[PDB]
Motif scaffolding. Structure first.
Motif, mmCIF file in Angstrom:
data_model
loop_
_atom_site.group_PDB
_atom_site.id
_atom_site.type_symbol
_atom_site.label_atom_id
_atom_site.label_comp_id
_atom_site.label_asym_id
_atom_site.label_seq_id
_atom_site.Cartn_x
_atom_site.Cartn_y
_atom_site.Cartn_z
ATOM 1 N N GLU A 247 8.972 19.033 -25.660
ATOM 2 C CA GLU A 247 9.455 19.931 -26.697
ATOM 3 C C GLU A 247 10.809 20.510 -26.339
ATOM 4 O OE1 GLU A 247 8.376 20.561 -29.639
ATOM 5 O OE2 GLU A 247 6.240 20.036 -29.618
ATOM 6 N N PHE A 248 10.990 20.953 -25.095
ATOM 7 C CA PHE A 248 12.298 21.495 -24.733
ATOM 8 C C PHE A 248 13.372 20.418 -24.841
ATOM 9 C CE2 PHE A 248 10.216 25.165 -22.330
ATOM 10 C CZ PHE A 248 10.813 26.169 -23.068
ATOM 11 N N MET A 249 13.064 19.191 -24.407
ATOM 12 C CA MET A 249 14.082 18.143 -24.496
ATOM 13 C C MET A 249 14.406 17.816 -25.953
ATOM 14 S SD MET A 249 15.315 17.475 -21.571
ATOM 15 C CE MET A 249 16.341 16.071 -22.094
ATOM 16 N N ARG A 250 13.409 17.863 -26.831
ATOM 17 C CA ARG A 250 13.685 17.683 -28.259
ATOM 18 C C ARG A 250 14.634 18.756 -28.774
ATOM 19 N NH1 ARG A 250 12.295 20.299 -32.264
ATOM 20 N NH2 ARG A 250 10.585 21.456 -31.262
ATOM 21 N N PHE B 166 -3.385 25.047 -25.662
ATOM 22 C CA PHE B 166 -3.544 24.951 -27.103
ATOM 23 C C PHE B 166 -2.797 23.773 -27.722
ATOM 24 C CE2 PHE B 166 -6.314 28.171 -28.795
ATOM 25 C CZ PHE B 166 -6.602 28.918 -27.668
ATOM 26 N N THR B 167 -2.002 23.009 -26.965
ATOM 27 C CA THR B 167 -1.526 21.704 -27.440
ATOM 28 C C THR B 167 -2.472 20.564 -27.091
ATOM 29 O OG1 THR B 167 -0.336 21.070 -25.449
ATOM 30 C CG2 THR B 167 0.864 22.334 -27.119
ATOM 31 N N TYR B 168 -3.513 20.846 -26.308
ATOM 32 C CA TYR B 168 -4.483 19.849 -25.833
ATOM 33 C C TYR B 168 -3.822 18.649 -25.161
ATOM 34 C CZ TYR B 168 -8.670 21.788 -28.140
ATOM 35 O OH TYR B 168 -9.706 22.612 -28.557
ATOM 36 N N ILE B 169 -2.719 18.894 -24.453
ATOM 37 C CA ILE B 169 -1.896 17.857 -23.828
ATOM 38 C C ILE B 169 -1.644 16.700 -24.796
ATOM 39 C CG2 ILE B 169 -1.509 16.613 -21.648
ATOM 40 C CD1 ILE B 169 -2.108 19.589 -21.392
ATOM 41 N N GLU B 170 -1.453 17.021 -26.077
ATOM 42 C CA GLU B 170 -1.144 16.004 -27.079
ATOM 43 C C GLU B 170 0.214 15.377 -26.801
ATOM 44 O OE1 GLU B 170 -0.515 17.380 -31.165
ATOM 45 O OE2 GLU B 170 0.295 15.396 -31.620
ATOM 46 N N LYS B 171 0.292 14.054 -26.951
ATOM 47 C CA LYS B 171 1.558 13.361 -26.742
ATOM 48 C C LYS B 171 2.654 14.008 -27.577
ATOM 49 N N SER B 172 3.782 14.286 -26.938
ATOM 50 C CA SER B 172 5.020 14.756 -27.541
ATOM 51 C C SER B 172 5.050 16.269 -27.654
ATOM 52 C CB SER B 172 5.294 14.132 -28.928
ATOM 53 O OG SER B 172 4.379 14.580 -29.920
ATOM 54 N N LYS B 173 3.947 16.958 -27.352
ATOM 55 C CA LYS B 173 3.891 18.409 -27.433
ATOM 56 C C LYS B 173 4.032 19.103 -26.080
ATOM 57 C CE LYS B 173 3.247 18.029 -31.803
ATOM 58 N NZ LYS B 173 4.287 18.535 -32.749
ATOM 59 N N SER B 174 4.138 18.364 -24.988
ATOM 60 C CA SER B 174 4.248 18.985 -23.669
ATOM 61 C C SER B 174 5.520 19.841 -23.613
ATOM 62 C CB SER B 174 4.273 17.933 -22.573
ATOM 63 O OG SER B 174 5.511 17.207 -22.590
ATOM 64 N N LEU C 11 9.274 27.603 -27.225
ATOM 65 C CA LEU C 11 8.321 26.595 -27.633
ATOM 66 C C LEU C 11 7.651 27.017 -28.943
ATOM 67 C CD1 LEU C 11 6.701 26.005 -24.044
ATOM 68 C CD2 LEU C 11 8.076 24.334 -25.332
ATOM 69 N N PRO C 12 7.344 26.069 -29.829
ATOM 70 C CA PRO C 12 6.732 26.400 -31.125
ATOM 71 C C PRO C 12 5.243 26.714 -30.996
ATOM 72 C CG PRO C 12 6.789 24.023 -30.846
ATOM 73 C CD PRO C 12 7.513 24.610 -29.644
ATOM 74 N N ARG C 13 4.695 27.314 -32.059
ATOM 75 C CA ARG C 13 3.230 27.537 -32.127
ATOM 76 C C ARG C 13 2.530 26.179 -32.221
ATOM 77 N NH1 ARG C 13 -0.514 27.814 -35.916
ATOM 78 N NH2 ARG C 13 1.076 27.677 -37.562
ATOM 79 N N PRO C 14 1.580 25.868 -31.344
ATOM 80 C CA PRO C 14 0.877 24.591 -31.480
ATOM 81 C C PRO C 14 0.079 24.531 -32.777
ATOM 82 C CG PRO C 14 0.628 25.413 -29.253
ATOM 83 C CD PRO C 14 1.245 26.536 -30.063
#
Ligand code: 2V9
Length: 300
Positions: A228-231, A216-224, A256-259
């Motif tokens: 997200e965990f490193m952020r 559900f993140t569609y492998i969008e950049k920065s959402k992996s 992890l947040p809701r996409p």
């Protein structure tokens, strides 16, 4: 001793297995596309071939177990075992599998957003759960569920693919304790896997929740999950400090947040998979039914 047991060494003879191109790097080995053309008439079948990256005695032994695992599985949502090639004059081992043209689900989501919508994502989710139900009946723990390790036959069918980390449960226990860890996909790991090296059907369910997140993140950049965990942890951090913070975050309900665009109901499934209480996680049978009821409850 007296009588050895081996797969048919004449089924895939190395002299008819023609290397076409590399396909990618997986757990402990790499995968190549070949054509198996025993009538040397430029016909035959295209196949996928897994080979070790470091051919140590220990890795060869682990690879044999991986081959036996895959051979034991026959399911629409598990990549098809075809056989073994005893290459280098029967002094090496390579795993032969069916060829699935669209490669990893991770790459398909990135490359083919034109034909992906939520209906398709739920269909893939269902298929993944059913393959995992099937593994459970053999007391196999996959241990690396992630969209990089799921394969895409076509827009209507995905299959669990990489079994390089898969373990068989002991007869008397409901978990496998890994006592020689190597490279670990920590951002897919359940907390008890991080803190106690314990792997179970329930830790596979945790990781399935991360797979559902990935879809559900569609492998969008920065959402992996790693990004997200490193952020959340701090992008500056390095080494074991990363693991320390990941453990502390998960134990106290960081998630992890809701996409963007993810329905609340699908996010709630993720959240229920991400339960620190191992026994309260849903089963793959629960998940397949719930996901197929959601799909069936749409109009039409
Ligand atoms: C290493 C990896 O290479 C790519 C995907 C992949 O899983 C890496 O993300 N990869 C492809 C990329 C583009 C087209 C096809 C594939 C492919 C295939 C397999 C596998 C496979 C089986 C067991 C472990 C890893 C495997 N891969 C496979 C794979 C098994 N059958 C395949 O067709």
């Amino acid at each position: 001793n007296l009588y050895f047991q081996s797969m048919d060494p004449t089924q895939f003879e190395e002299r008819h297995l023609k290397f076409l191109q590399q396909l990618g790097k997986g757990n402990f080995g790499s995968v190549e596309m070949c054509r198996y053309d025993p009538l040397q008439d430029n016909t035959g079948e295209v196949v996928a071939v897994k080979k070790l990256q470091h051919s140590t005695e220990e890795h060869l032994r682990d690879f044999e177990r991986e081959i036996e695992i895959l051979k034991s599985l026959q399911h629409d949502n598990i990549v098809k075992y075809k056989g073994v090639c005893y290459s280098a004059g029967r002094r090496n081992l390579k795993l032969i599998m069916e060829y699935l043209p669209y490669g990893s689900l991770r790459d398909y989501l990135q490359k083919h957003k034109e034909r992906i919508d939520h209906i398709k994502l739920l269909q893939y989710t269902s298929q993944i759960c059913k393959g995992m139900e099937y593994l459970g009946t053999k007391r196999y723990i996959h241990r690396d569920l992630a969209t990089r390790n799921i394969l895409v036959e076509n827009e209507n069918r995905v299959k669990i693919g990489d079994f390089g980390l898969t373990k068989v449960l002991p007869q008397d226990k409901e978990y496998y304790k890994v006592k020689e860890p190597g490279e670990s996909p920590i951002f897919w790991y359940a907390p008890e896997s991080l803190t106690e090296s314990k792997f179970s059907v329930a830790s596979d369910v945790w990781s399935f929740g991360v797979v559902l997140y990935e879809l559900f993140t569609y492998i969008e950049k920065s959402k992996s999950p790693p990004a997200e965990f490193m952020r959340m942890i701090g992008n500056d951090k390095q080494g074991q400090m990363i693991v320390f913070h990941l453990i502390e975050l998960l134990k106290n309900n960081g998630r992890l947040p809701r996409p963007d665009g993810c329905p609340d109901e699908i996010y709630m499934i993720m959240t229920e998979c991400w339960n620190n209480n191992v026994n309260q996680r849903p089963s793959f049978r629960d998940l397949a039914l719930r996901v197929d009821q959601i799909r069936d409850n749409m109009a039409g």
